[PDB]
Amino acid sequence: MKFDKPAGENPIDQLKVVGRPHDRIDGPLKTTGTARYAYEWHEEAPNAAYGYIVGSAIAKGRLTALDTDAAQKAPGVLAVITASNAGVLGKGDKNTARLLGGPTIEHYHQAIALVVAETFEQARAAASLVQAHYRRNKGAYSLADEKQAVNQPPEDTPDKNVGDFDGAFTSAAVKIDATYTTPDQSHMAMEPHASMAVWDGNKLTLWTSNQMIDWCRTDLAKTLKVPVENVRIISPYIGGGFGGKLFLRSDALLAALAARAVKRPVKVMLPRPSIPNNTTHRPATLQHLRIGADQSGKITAISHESWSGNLPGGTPETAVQQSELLYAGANRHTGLRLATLDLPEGNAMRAPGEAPGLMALEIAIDELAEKAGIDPVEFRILNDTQVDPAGPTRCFSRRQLIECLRTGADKFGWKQRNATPGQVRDGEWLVGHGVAAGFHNNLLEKSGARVHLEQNGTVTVETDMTDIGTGSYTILAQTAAEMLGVPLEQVAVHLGDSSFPVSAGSGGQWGANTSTSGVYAACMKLREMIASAVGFDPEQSQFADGKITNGTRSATLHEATAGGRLTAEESIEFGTLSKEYQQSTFAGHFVEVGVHSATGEVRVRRMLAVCAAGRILNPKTARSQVIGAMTMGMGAALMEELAVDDRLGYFVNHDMAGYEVPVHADIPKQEVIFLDDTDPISSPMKAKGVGELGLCGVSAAIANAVYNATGIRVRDYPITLDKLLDKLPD
Amino acid sequence: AATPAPEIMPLTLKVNGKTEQLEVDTRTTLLDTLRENLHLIGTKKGCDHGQCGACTVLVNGRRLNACLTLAVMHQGAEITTIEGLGSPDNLHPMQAAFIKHDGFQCGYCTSGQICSSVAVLKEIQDGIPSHVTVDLVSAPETTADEIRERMSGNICRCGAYANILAAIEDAAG
Amino acid sequence: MKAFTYERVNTPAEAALSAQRVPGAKFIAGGTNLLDLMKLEIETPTHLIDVNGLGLDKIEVTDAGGLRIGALVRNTDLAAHERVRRDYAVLSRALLAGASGQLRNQATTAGNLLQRTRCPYFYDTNQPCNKRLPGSGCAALEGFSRQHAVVGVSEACIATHPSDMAVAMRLLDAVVETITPEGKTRSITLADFYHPPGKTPHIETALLPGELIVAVTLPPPLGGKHIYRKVRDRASYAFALVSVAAIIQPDGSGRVALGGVAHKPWRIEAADAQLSQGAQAVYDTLFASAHPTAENTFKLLLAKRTLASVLAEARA
Ligand SMILES: Cc1cc2nc3c(=O)[nH]c(=O)nc-3n(C[C@H](O)[C@H](O)[C@H](O)COP(=O)(O)OP(=O)(O)OC[C@H]3O[C@@H](n4cnc5c(N)ncnc54)[C@H](O)[C@@H]3O)c2cc1C
Ligand SMILES: Nc1ccn([C@@H]2O[C@H](COP(=O)(O)OP(=O)(O)OC[C@H]3Oc4nc5nc(N)nc(O)c5nc4C(S)=C3S)[C@@H](O)[C@H]2O)c(=O)n1
Ligand code: SF4
Ligand code: MOS
Numbered sequence A: 001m002k003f004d005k006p007a008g009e010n011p012i013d014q015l016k017v018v019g020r021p022h023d024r025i026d027g028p029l030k031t032t033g034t035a036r037y038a039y040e041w042h043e044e045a046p047n048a049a050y051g052y053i054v055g056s057a058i059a060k061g062r063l064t065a066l067d068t069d070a071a072q073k074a075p076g077v078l079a080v081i082t083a084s085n086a087g088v089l090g091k092g093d094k095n096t097a098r099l100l101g102g103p104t105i106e107h108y109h110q111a112i113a114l115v116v117a118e119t120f121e122q123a124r125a126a127a128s129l130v131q132a133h134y135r136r137n138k139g140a141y142s143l144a145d146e147k148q149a150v151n152q153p154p155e156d157t158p159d160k161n162v163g164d165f166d167g168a169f170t171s172a173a174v175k176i177d178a179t180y181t182t183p184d185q186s187h188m189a190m191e192p193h194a195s196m197a198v199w200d201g202n203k204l205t206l207w208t209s210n211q212m213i214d215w216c217r218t219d220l221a222k223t224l225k226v227p228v229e230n231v232r233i234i235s236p237y238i239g240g241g242f243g244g245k246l247f248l249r250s251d252a253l254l255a256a257l258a259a260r261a262v263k264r265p266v267k268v269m270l271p272r273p274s275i276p277n278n279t280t281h282r283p284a285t286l287q288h289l290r291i292g293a294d295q296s297g298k299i300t301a302i303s304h305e306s307w308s309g310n311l312p313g314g315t316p317e318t319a320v321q322q323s324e325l326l327y328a329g330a331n332r333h334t335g336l337r338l339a340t341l342d343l344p345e346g347n348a349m350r351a352p353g354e355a356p357g358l359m360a361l362e363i364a365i366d367e368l369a370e371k372a373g374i375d376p377v378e379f380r381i382l383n384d385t386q387v388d389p390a391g392p393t394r395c396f397s398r399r400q401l402i403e404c405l406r407t408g409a410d411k412f413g414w415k416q417r418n419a420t421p422g423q424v425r426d427g428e429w430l431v432g433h434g435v436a437a438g439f440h441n442n443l444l445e446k447s448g449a450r451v452h453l454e455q456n457g458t459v460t461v462e463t464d465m466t467d468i469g470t471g472s473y474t475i476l477a478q479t480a481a482e483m484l485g486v487p488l489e490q491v492a493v494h495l496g497d498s499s500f501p502v503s504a505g506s507g508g509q510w511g512a513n514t515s516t517s518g519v520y521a522a523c524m525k526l527r528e529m530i531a532s533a534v535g536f537d538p539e540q541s542q543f544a545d546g547k548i549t550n551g552t553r554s555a556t557l558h559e560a561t562a563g564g565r566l567t568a569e570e571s572i573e574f575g576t577l578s579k580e581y582q583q584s585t586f587a588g589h590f591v592e593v594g595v596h597s598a599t600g601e602v603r604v605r606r607m608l609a610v611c612a613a614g615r616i617l618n619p620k621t622a623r624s625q626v627i628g629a630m631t632m633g634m635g636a637a638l639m640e641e642l643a644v645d646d647r648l649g650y651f652v653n654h655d656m657a658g659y660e661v662p663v664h665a666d667i668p669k670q671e672v673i674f675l676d677d678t679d680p681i682s683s684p685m686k687a688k689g690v691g692e693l694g695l696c697g698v699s700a701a702i703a704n705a706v707y708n709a710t711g712i713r714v715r716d717y718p719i720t721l722d723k724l725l726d727k728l729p730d
Numbered sequence B: 001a002a003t004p005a006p007e008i009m010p011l012t013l014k015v016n017g018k019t020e021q022l023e024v025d026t027r028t029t030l031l032d033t034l035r036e037n038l039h040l041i042g043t044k045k046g047c048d049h050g051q052c053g054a055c056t057v058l059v060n061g062r063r064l065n066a067c068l069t070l071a072v073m074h075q076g077a078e079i080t081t082i083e084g085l086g087s088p089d090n091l092h093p094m095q096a097a098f099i100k101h102d103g104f105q106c107g108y109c110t111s112g113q114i115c116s117s118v119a120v121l122k123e124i125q126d127g128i129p130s131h132v133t134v135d136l137v138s139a140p141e142t143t144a145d146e147i148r149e150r151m152s153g154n155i156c157r158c159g160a161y162a163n164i165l166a167a168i169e170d171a172a173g
Numbered sequence C: 001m002k003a004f005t006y007e008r009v010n011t012p013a014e015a016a017l018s019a020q021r022v023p024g025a026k027f028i029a030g031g032t033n034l035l036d037l038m039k040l041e042i043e044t045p046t047h048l049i050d051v052n053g054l055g056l057d058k059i060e061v062t063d064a065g066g067l068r069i070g071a072l073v074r075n076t077d078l079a080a081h082e083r084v085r086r087d088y089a090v091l092s093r094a095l096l097a098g099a100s101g102q103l104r105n106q107a108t109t110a111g112n113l114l115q116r117t118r119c120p121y122f123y124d125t126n127q128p129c130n131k132r133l134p135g136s137g138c139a140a141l142e143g144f145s146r147q148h149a150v151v152g153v154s155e156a157c158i159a160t161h162p163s164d165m166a167v168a169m170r171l172l173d174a175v176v177e178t179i180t181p182e183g184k185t186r187s188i189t190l191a192d193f194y195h196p197p198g199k200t201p202h203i204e205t206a207l208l209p210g211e212l213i214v215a216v217t218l219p220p221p222l223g224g225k226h227i228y229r230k231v232r233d234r235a236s237y238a239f240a241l242v243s244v245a246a247i248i249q250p251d252g253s254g255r256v257a258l259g260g261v262a263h264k265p266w267r268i269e270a271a272d273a274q275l276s277q278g279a280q281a282v283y284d285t286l287f288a289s290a291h292p293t294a295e296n297t298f299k300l301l302l303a304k305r306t307l308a309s310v311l312a313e314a315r316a
């Protein structure tokens, strides 16, 4: 199925099961400890050995020698895998840093060996005996120090320039020029990265924790230099990812290598203290915004430059793209600048680019609104753009930012806010209200599925799509149930296995829409095959109450499969609609905060998100995404920071205590409203993403709330009490 | 230069009503005993350092973090894990409430949330105060403020918290 | 973690005797600090002696009208005890302000006093840390020092003692009761229990080889308004940036001790006597000797403002 014209009426529009807040179908497994994650597949390899990682003790240099004799001789030890003895490896396309270091050391805690042993305890103790030898090289670890030397963009990412920014900035009646920083952030998915490998001759089966099954299979094969068809990836349950499990990490590589060397299954879990430096992190940013507006509050000039750092060939944090589309302005400048830093690999984290970009942009808007004498909700409404500001002929498919904000303000009681900061108390707490816009593009990617009508009348969905806590299992079941006229509870859904059709995976918040659209495409073929088995015309047939009807004629789905089960396998493909229109998603974030008038402690008292993200496939699991993202936004705003040591070249606070994420005690009332945003330009499901959108804007809403509570702007996240303390009352 | 050989010792635990007789490395945590030695994988390992609560279990009715106690320390103890509370076709009321309110996403913290929440209601009934208990001498009440604090030792990176609270208040009434 | 033998014994006397006889032996109580450190091989004992189940877990009234708290009493049970809630409220508040429910259930009185720093350079064995390896350096001094000590420090180490319960014990003039492996007993006032880092930050307390804490004795109750204000970046499950323990009498006199500012609970008796004069005077005496880094300077203003907030709470 090629989707290249907007969707008309189709069976999903009935919304008998799609669109409804169903309990998630993996709920019984996840609440009883019977869902199996990567390290927990005992029956599949009951004598599996344990692999324990040795990370680099230096940030950067040469591994001159790696001694393994003492470890080899230790109790229960089978082997030590090293770069030397593992043989020549390839590198996967999504890995900047090598997953097995040696001789070059690219970053701190880069894996350099793996001790395989009979028990976990023996492998860990044995890993302590591995003696590495290093020669340090001079590295660069400070994004702010590298800033000054970088003032061109990358060759393949030129600046974007519309109109005359400098002229319009000069002429503007009111304007701001402000700098914002965001720190390095870490995923802290509650399930550590783990994998288990079994070889059967040249055939590899890997049980793992990965968001992108097909990317995993391909990249593992490229790395091991084996035929891709010899590798099988299995990841039905993933204990969180947040971008951090989009790629092949060193557990999967080392399990695979270990299991082949010892000719026995091996399982490898990255220990929690090693994860923040071994894996990836959201890059820190440093952002320069200059925005100009006229007498009437219409933005006339916008400039957004962002500086980020990464290893050679690594990605920038794409923090300026939202500023090309979100607000109006005839005169525009955007630009990325990428430093080389010898920290661990910077890579995607929930809403890469947009989370930090809006962290800056939406304070800047708050500031400029204040300067214009205009309510920040009205300021944003005033500068809505229903077309691409760099190409006015190019419409947004569907844009409800205005409606998000107005609805939000009405529900929130935004009019109750005191516009003069610092004037509202509740006991010892300064109370504040703030607002921010969310924005995130809707990306499309090809996705396939296989769907079976079984002879007992049940339906079987197979696809390699993942459910990382998103609810894919459930929404895919709703999709098939809707299309075939069966109740939800008759649909089996099988995910996260490379022996199933290739889906787009859980990433870019394209997963709900792409994966359900693939199922839609398979189910359309299946309906056709069913119609044909009972001698009916597909075009004139309907599917309901476990039956197919066709005018006056009527058969049961049991009869269609009397001559064996019916199987359809199809993909959805996307044409030029994402060029023709700008497909995006929008939100309004409203926050009330408390700031302690003595200590400067910040506590969120109330949060509302109003979202517009196409047709909501499941309001319950969708609401969960957004309150989840709101929680993550709170962390980014108030507590989350990977502390860089500039001298030693690593993240100092590299664990679940030192890197503070939000706890139960932090969480206020959190309300979510989904606007009816049905977008037929997106897909036949008419859906768009929420999982990353829900984070976008949250942190700046909070920052703008703290300002309203205190009169104190903080442009260096996170907004911790030390940054507020010297400007509070007495 | 070297590391010593495992010290192996016999061990009797009562896990979910069932008498288990093991021989364990003295280093083995209660957590790893359940997951690796007994194959009760419902109890999860989020951090191994007492920082997350994903390995929360009951030992003689009292909740603790199984990653920061040794198996050999609980010779003859009654251990209760998530599997002991209920299973898919006989859900515990808390397990069921969690499904109803969507108190989980990825599911990795969820065992721990559930074990803690059942013990938390018990602790309130037993009159154990908390950080947010205003009047220390009088008996604590089952408020939203109290549950949040008492549950703050179970970390959810998915951010299912607001729903977890709704599940617990439901099961409590 | 290195392999170790594990011993259960019958009496507390046996436990201390075994600690003398076996080089590298350590006592284990709740295990909530010791096992954490052992996984990383920061502690590497060859032998563990279980000190639970030896009758050291009672809370009793003393003949003087105070309280004897057993070393092995759980933190939850100490904080929940009726006498402690009415008569020693600041102890109960400090306990409840720390850690999590799971952790407080297993952690013990002795264990809590002897918990080690949360310094992140200390916890990372690839980094310079004089505490873990004498003369290797202090990475925190010119590195990430945001949560380190501002008073009582030295060039060699700037670590804070992480205990909230110890701040409340120090305020109450608590006394640590021990038995030596020899079989004699000692009382160490908690004010004299923690050594300053000086040039030997690896030396932390006054305990001898294999000395066993059996109890902590509190004197008679003071009455007054008891408060424990703990400041932290998130609402729960975090160590103190700064903490103020106070006991305020009706006439404005009282005592205070602080956490998060030094290698031990920080209380100066001259400063107690200036409470009626205000937070400014009390602070000036408490922090006359302060030596912060740029990153933890904020703690000084935090201490003063938190203390002022505490005194204002007491007036109301
Ligand atoms: C995530 C996390 C958060 C925390 N947050 C806080 C907080 O906010 N506030 C706070 O105060 N604490 C906090 N803690 C620390 C906790 O309070 C302590 O770990 C606990 O008090 C230690 O008690 P234990 O009995 O487990 O000691 P153990 O771990 O058993 O032993 C600790 C030390 O004492 C020795 N020992 C034990 N008993 C005796 C005895 N009778 N005589 C002599 N030596 C003995 C051991 O050999 C060892 O060196 C936290 C811990 C964690 C993991
Ligand atoms: N219009 C449709 C859009 C989506 N959803 C809901 O939300 C999920 C989100 O789907 P979608 O926004 O397409 O996002 P993905 O399927 O693509 O999953 C990835 C996405 O998921 C998010 N949230 C996740 N939450 C779980 N708990 N853990 C993760 O790692 C996280 N990863 C973030 C990130 S990073 C990213 S990219 C569905 O499964 C469903 O419950 C549906 O109800 N409304
Ligand atoms: S501060 Fe004390 S502990 Fe932290 S590093 Fe310097 S010496 Fe080691
Ligand atoms: O693209 Mo989301 O998985 S960082």
Ligand code: FES
Pocket (backbone or CB within 6 Å): B044, B045, B046, B047, B048, B049, B050, B051, B052, B053, B054, B055, B056, B065, B066, B067, B068
């Ligand atoms: S695994 Fe026990 S607390 Fe994280």
Ligand code: FES
Pocket (backbone or CB within 6 Å): A190, A239, A240, A469, B103, B104, B105, B106, B107, B108, B109, B110, B155, B156, B157, B158, B159, B160
């Ligand atoms: S459900 Fe994913 S961590 Fe709580």
Ligand SMILES: [Cl-]
Pocket (backbone or CB within 6 Å): A020, A021, A022, A023
């Ligand atoms: Cl429903």
Ligand SMILES: [Cl-]
Pocket (backbone or CB within 6 Å): A136, A137, A138
């Ligand atoms: Cl160098």
Ligand SMILES: [Cl-]
Pocket (backbone or CB within 6 Å): A402, A403, A406, A407
């Ligand atoms: Cl409107």
Ligand SMILES: [Cl-]
Pocket (backbone or CB within 6 Å): A011, A541, A542, A543
């Ligand atoms: Cl139909």
Ligand SMILES: [Cl-]
Pocket (backbone or CB within 6 Å): A021, A619
């Ligand atoms: Cl609804």
Ligand SMILES: [Cl-]
Pocket (backbone or CB within 6 Å): A021, A619, A620, A623
């Ligand atoms: Cl709902």
Ligand SMILES: [Cl-]
Pocket (backbone or CB within 6 Å): A652, A653, A657, A658, A659, C120, C147
């Ligand atoms: Cl830290």
Ligand SMILES: [Cl-]
Pocket (backbone or CB within 6 Å): B093, B094, B118, B121, B171, B172
């Ligand atoms: Cl219950």
Ligand SMILES: [Cl-]
Pocket (backbone or CB within 6 Å): C130, C134, C135, C136, C156, C199, C200, C201
């Ligand atoms: Cl020294």
Ligand SMILES: [Cl-]
Pocket (backbone or CB within 6 Å): A730, C279, C304, C305, C308
């Ligand atoms: Cl003041």
